[PDB]
Ligand binder design. Structure first.
Ligand SMILES: [Ca+2]
Ligand SMILES: [Cl-]
Length: 255
């Protein structure tokens, strides 16, 4: 079987607090997939789109999607993005969590673009997330067989750091602006058993061993976001996170 590349909304199931924003006012785009709209932070403020067919790590995988982060502080906005492999589905993600906190569904792994501070997350402490502006980070993570999340693969706090938004409105400066649509590339090279993620001009690397995933078992792939809340002060904003799912590309090899 040769690889195929698919594109289109119809290739994904929608779970939880995810919808389509037909006509964004602030982005050059239509029909964006939108997370965390119309609901305050809490246990159920989470969403996933799940590719309808399974992948396995005997074969290459390549996924590209443009994402646009909320232009909201890390104490008011969303938790981030989790590009997650799981043997279970989007309902299991809604029940048990993902890869954006300290614990989620067991034996999942993937790439985390972290945009939200949580007072009980030890990785947010390591990564120096607390503070002003739009402080976040990228990294691979895995959930162990209990669900506990840990950083895996390349990076240090200094190199993982990224400003996930800014206050500018210019399209001429040659700079990254995380509130605009910017591609995320997540790929897996079966020949060297290595996952690569790129975003914001930065790269991260992790082996299959480091992610803890099976070399042969079938996995689902989910694009997740959430806004679970950081305490109960009532200080929050919309947490709206958007992705061009209709324009995304996913390359895999069907059985
Ligand atoms: Ca965080
Ligand atoms: Cl449509």
């Amino acid at each position: 079987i040769p690889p195929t590349t698919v594109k289109g909304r119809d290739n994904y199931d929608f779970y939880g607090r995810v919808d389509i924003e037909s006509n964004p006012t602030d982005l050059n785009a239509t029909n964006l997939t939108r997370y965390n709209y119309g609901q305050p932070p809490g246990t159920t403020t989470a969403g996933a789109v799940q590719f309808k067919n399974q992948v396995s790590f005997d074969k290459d995988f390549d996924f590209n999607i443009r994402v646009a982060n909320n232009r909201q502080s890390n104490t008011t906005g969303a938790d981030g993005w989790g590009f997650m492999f799981s043997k279970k589905d989007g309902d299991d993600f809604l029940k048990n969590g993902g890869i954006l906190r300290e614990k989620g569904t067991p034996s999942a792994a993937g790439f985390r673009i972290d945009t939200g501070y949580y007072n009980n997350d030890p990785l947010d402490k390591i990564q120096k997330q607390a503070g002003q502006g739009y402080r976040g980070y990228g990294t691979f993570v895995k959930n162990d067989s209990q669900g506990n999340t840990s950083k895996v693969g390349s990076g240090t706090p200094s190199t993982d750091f990224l400003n996930y938004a800014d206050n500018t409105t210019n399209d001429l400066d040659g700079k990254f602006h995380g509130q605009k649509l910017n591609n995320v590339n997540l790929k897996y090279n079966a020949s060297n058993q290595t996952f690569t993620a790129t975003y914001a001009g930065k790269t991260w690397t992790a082996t299959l061993s480091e992610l803890g995933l099976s070399p042969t078992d079938s996995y689902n792939f989910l694009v997740t976001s959430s806004q679970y809340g950081n305490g109960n002060s009532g200080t929050y904003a919309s947490g709206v996170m958007r992705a061009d799912l209709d324009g995304a590309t996913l390359t895999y090899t069907p059985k």
